[PDB]
Amino acid sequence: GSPGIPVPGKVTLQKDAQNLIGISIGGGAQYCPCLYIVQVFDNTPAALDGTVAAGDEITGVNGRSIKGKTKVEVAKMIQEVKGEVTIHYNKLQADPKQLEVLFQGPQFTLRHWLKV
Structure with missing residues (x-):
């Protein structure tokens, strides 16, 4: 589907030594807005070349x-x-x-989020 998102983009990287990206995903917290990425680690592909850091x-x-x-x-x-x-x-x-x-x-909002 397409809910009409603002400015869509994509960055392509490769898995980390830990077989992941280095992030944490939560499907919104307060009123469950969007965000998804709650936190990242700077030296992970996600953060480093990725820039899919916290707040994206x-x-x-x-x-x-x-x-x-x-x-x-x-x-x-x-x-x-x-x-x-x-x-x-x-x-x-x-x-x-x-x-x-x-x-x-x-x-x-604590909740139980996921991470890769």
Whole structure:
């Protein structure tokens, strides 16, 4: 599908020594907005050449959206693609009200996120 995302983009990298990208995915926190990527490690492909760092909207893995399956499965999808890595991302300016919501500052929402 296509929900009309702002500015879509993709960066292609390759798996880390740990067989991942070096990120953490949560499908939104406060009101479950978007974001997906909650944190990254600078020396991971994701951060380093990737720049899919904390605050970016990783909406798809290697061309296929993650928003449709399951946390555990999406990490698997990324581990599945052995040796390679591609991230689809977006960048929402939102509106003041929704911008601070997308910002994620209030950390009352713990939840159980995923990581690769």
